[PDB]
């Protein structure tokens, strides 16, 4: 079943006061089952533990995420409202 990002509830997040507001939501899946979600910057990168492996996740200007995800896992991005 194609992961349906339109039916994913918002992450539980906090916009930290001393840094820019990040433009993206991310959602982490194992076997197409949501594991967690959060915020990240657009046109940027982050190191995240995805199950058994650290992954260097890149974001494009529209919050599309890419990385070398371990088998069975993926992290998908969406632009936040207003961004």
């Amino acid at each position: 079943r194609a992961i349906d990002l339109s039916r994913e509830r918002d992450p539980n997040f906090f916009d930290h006061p001393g840094i820019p507001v990040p433009e993206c939501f991310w959602f982490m899946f194992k076997n197409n089952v949501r594991q967690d979600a959060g915020t990240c910057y657009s046109s940027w990168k982050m190191d995240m533990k995805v199950g058994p492996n650290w992954v260097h996740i890149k974001s494009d200007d529209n919050c599309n995420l890419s990385g070398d995800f371990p088998p069975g896992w993926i992290v998908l991005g969406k632009k936040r409202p207003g961004f």
């Binding site: 906090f14 001393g18 840094i19 594991q35 959060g38 910057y41 940027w44 995240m48 533990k49």
Partner: protein, 77 residues
């Protein structure tokens, strides 16, 4: 840049979450701390020159088993 560090902490209830957050907020160079994640089991820390291995050590001894889950830099254009 500022760093953002996310740590998963074994935290039994809302008071243990309170205590892990108090411990982190007291740490050298922490600008801001929040409890995040679908299960409200992740501590997100933002600051300049935070020592993530010192921070994990402190949590492991005083609060609960802890796993580092994210390290990133704050984007400044």
């Amino acid at each position: 840049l500022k760093q953002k560090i996310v740590i998963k902490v074994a935290m039994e209830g809302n008071n243990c979450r309170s205590k892990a957050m108090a411990l982190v907020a007291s740490t050298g160079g922490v600008d801001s701390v929040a409890l995040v994640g679908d299960l409200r089991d992740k501590i997100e820390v933002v600051g300049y020159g935070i020592d993530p291995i010192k921070l994990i050590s402190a949590l492991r001894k005083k609060v609960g088993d802890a796993e580092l889950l994210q390290v990133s830099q704050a984007k400044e254009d």
